[PDB]
């Protein structure tokens, strides 16, 4: 905020824009208020009643989410695992010593305070096997509006056909709209998140197949973090080294935003990956909506470094495409030229001995490592304009790309450097 005046008449002007809060909620700021997350559920009706409730309800268009929650409880209540080591997260010691932990030890059971429904018989305990797998799979199916990508219902149908050969989807085609509402019931999401969190620890459980459909709950609305992992993998550099190659102020603020020190983002098994479905946070701090310049920068740099995932990563709105693209060009060019090949194994204890008697002064050549302090200086020697070898390198990287979707950084990079 600095004073601005109109030079024709010395009139003072106050340039101001509309403001949008859109604050950010971290997971660990939820647990300092409540030391436990509740699961609202109805424990009145019996299991074999709920089986026909949700089977006959599934066959038709009418079904109560309260009945699929109350059915998923008792349908998954007697599933267990033995902890090899202790399990604690955000001050919640879920598992103590060698005692076995169930799938609902993670949350606390509360009572929901009713749907009349309709019942069915002849439904044995052989449907308790896959009906949870089904209802869990429809959460992953019912989150995508693409007509052919929603055909993951064929892979849920297949994964249950593996459990019982004569399994065919008990839902009408109009059902493409039936389970789309299930993702709005907080307790259903608190169920799928507990299922995925449970089966992440107990990996080779006989019912680990249930994780299909709930795997989309892990790190949901946390794309930018996964782009940081993808960049730290594609570049081959450490997290602290990649962190230095951030040359844009927005990516700096966002990188400071993701790396707050008390959110267990590094723990293997934690409540953090499920901060959205558990209700630990209503606005994730690790999304590509609150970290747009980081998503664009890291994804584009990866793409220039021969990435495959980035070919379909989406281009955010309202960011500095020019500065971000130049930064990604210098970074990807630095990593591209500096392969840093070094001998690793020797036979007769003979290693490569570099020759230091090269004194013809081979200057005006790019640096030898991947240090930012040297590539910024070389780039200054290039007048902060990308050299034709950099632009040609990027053209080499983005050309021969085919089948590119619109609004993706693959078509963006191709449309930017391939001409």
């Amino acid at each position: 905020s600095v004073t601005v005046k109109r030079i024709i008449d010395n009139t003072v002007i106050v340039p101001k824009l509309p403001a949008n809060e859109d604050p950010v909620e971290y997971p660990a700021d939820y647990f300092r208020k409540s030391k436990e997350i509740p699961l609202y559920i109805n424990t009145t009706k019996s299991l074999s009643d709920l089986r026909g409730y949700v089977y006959q309800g599934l066959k038709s268009g009418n079904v109560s989410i309260i009945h699929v929650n109350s059915y998923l409880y008792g349908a998954l209540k007697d599933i267990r695992g033995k902890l090899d080591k202790d399990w604690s997260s955000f001050g919640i010691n879920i598992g103590k010593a060698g005692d076995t932990i169930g799938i609902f030890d993670l949350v606390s059971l509360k009572a929901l305070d009713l749907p009349d429904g309709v019942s069915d018989a002849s439904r044995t305990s052989a449907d308790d096997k896959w009906l949870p797998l089904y209802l869990l799979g429809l959460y992953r199916v019912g989150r995508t509006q693409m007509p052919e990508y929603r055909k993951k219902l064929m892979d849920g149908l297949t994964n249950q056909c593996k459990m019982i050969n004569e399994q065919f989807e008990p839902l009408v085609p109009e059902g493409r709209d039936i389970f789309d509402v299930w993702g709005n019931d907080s307790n259903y999401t608190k169920i799928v998140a507990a299922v995925d969190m449970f089966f992440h620890m107990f990996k080779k459980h006989e019912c680990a197949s249930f994780r299909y459909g709930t795997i989309v709950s892990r790190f949901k609305d946390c794309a930018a973090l996964a782009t940081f992992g993808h960049l730290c993998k594609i570049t081959g550099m450490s997290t602290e080294d990649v962190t230095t190659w951030i040359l844009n102020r927005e990516v700096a603020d966002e990188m400071v935003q993701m790396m707050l020190p008390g959110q267990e983002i590094d723990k293997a098994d934690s409540y953090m990956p499920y901060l959205i479905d558990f209700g630990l946070s209503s606005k994730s701090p690790y999304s590509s909506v609150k970290n747009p310049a980081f998503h664009f920068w890291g994804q584009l740099t990866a793409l220039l470094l021969r990435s495959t995932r980035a070919r379909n990563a989406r281009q955010p709105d309202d960011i500095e495409y020019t500065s971000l693209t130049t930064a990604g060009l210098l970074y990807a060019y630095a990593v591209g030229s500096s392969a840093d090949l070094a001998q690793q194994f020797c036979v007769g204890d003979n290693k490569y001995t570099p020759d230091d008697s090269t004194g013809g002064l081979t200057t005006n050549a790019p640096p030898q490592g991947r240090d930012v302090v040297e590539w910024l200086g070389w780039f200054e020697d290039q007048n902060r304009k990308p050299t034709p070898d950099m632009m040609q390198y990027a053209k080499r990287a983005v050309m021969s790309l085919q089948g590119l979707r619109e609004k993706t950084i693959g078509k963006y990079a191709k449309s930017e450097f391939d001409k």
Epitope: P38, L39, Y40, I41, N42, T43, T44, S70, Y73, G74, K77, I94, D99, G102, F104, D105, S108, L109, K110, A111, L112, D113
Partner: nanobody, 122 residues
């Protein structure tokens, strides 16, 4: 597994109040229904009161509505039950029960765990 211990019984004057408690041991960090039952001399075990896990949904037998009150503190893993305006028809052994779920049944076949029971004479 879960163990339940009933405490708070005894004799009381006809028309007097009393409050039983039930302490749970073992695995209190899991869904489990809480209900009170009783059995009179030569009478089959009957339902008295029940409470859901969260501690919002409750229900009482007709013979005790108004008088009795049920409550639970799952932090201390217990469940109190006030018994005001007692009557000699109220004389029976009172049992604390648990069935693992998210509700409270009105029958005795819905529970899974039972205490040893306390005598209450009026």
């Amino acid at each position: 597994q879960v163990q339940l211990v009933e405490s708070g019984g005894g004799l009381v004057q006809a028309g007097g109040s009393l409050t039983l408690s039930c302490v749970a041991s073992g695995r209190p960090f899991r869904n489990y229904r809480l209900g009170w039952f009783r059995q009179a001399p030569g009478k089959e075990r009957e339902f008295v009161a029940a409470i859901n896990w969260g501690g919002v949904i409750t229900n009482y037998a007709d013979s005790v509505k108004g008088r009795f009150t049920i409550s639970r503190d799952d932090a201390k893993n217990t469940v109190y039950l006030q018994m005001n305006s007692l009557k000699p028809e109220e004389t029976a052994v009172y049992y604390c029960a648990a069935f693992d779920s998210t509700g409270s049944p009105i029958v005795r076949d819905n529970y899974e765990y039972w205490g040893q029971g306390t005598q209450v004479t009026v």
